[PDB]
């Protein structure tokens, strides 16, 4: 079996985090996202 | 033999859910009441 | 204006998709034609 | 900050879930024990 795919850039997303919007992101896109999802702009908590 | 999806905000049936920018499933009532954003994750509705 | 979901088998509109055991989204036509298993992943339908 | 996904069979953590033909999320333990098909929906493994 392969890993999940990032729904922003379609690279492999090995161990994706649980996000509030349920999107799947690779580490690169998540670290680059700032304060909200790059796909739907759901704000990240804190 | 199969039932409909469930609303992730109120847990009722969501028979014909709309495609939202986030991946959530909402019944029509919860969508109509939501204002400018998803009531679960606050993804803004597209303008 | 929100749109309806898309069938993952034929990519037509799936306005009121049923909840399947595998979580795929199918239009009513593709579900009616499916026989006893999912046309995408072959998850068996209950019975 | 963010937590990881949950296994949909046992509800434990699934840190790095594999892509299955069905859309289910399994921890590695539940996947290793599954045999030739998904333990939730019985979609056959390729
Ligand atoms: Zn990515
Ligand atoms: Zn998102
Ligand atoms: Zn609702
Ligand atoms: Zn949402
Ligand atoms: Zn179809
Ligand atoms: Zn399926
Ligand atoms: Zn498990
Ligand atoms: Zn499954």
Residue numbers in the entry:
A (entry chain C): 52 to 97
B (entry chain B), C (entry chain A): 51 to 97
D (entry chain D): 51 to 96
List passages from the publication reporting this PDB structure.
PML belongs to the TRIM family of proteins, defined by the presence of a RING domain, one or two other zinc fingers and a long coiled coil. PML NBs also recruit enzymes implicated in several post-translational modifications, primarily UBC9, the key E2 SUMO-conjugating enzyme, possibly facilitating partner sumoylation. Here we report the crystallographic high-resolution structure of PML RING, and demonstrate that it assembles into a tetrameric torus.
We have determined the crystal structure of PML RING at a 1.6 Å resolution by single wavelength anomalous dispersion. Sub-domain 1 (SD1FQF) is a loop containing only three residues, F52Q53F54, while sub-domain 2 (SD2), comprising residues 55–99, is a classic C3HC4 RING finger. As oligomerization proceeds, the buried surface of PML RING tetramer increases significantly to 4216 Å2, accounting for ~40% of the overall surface of PML RING tetramer.
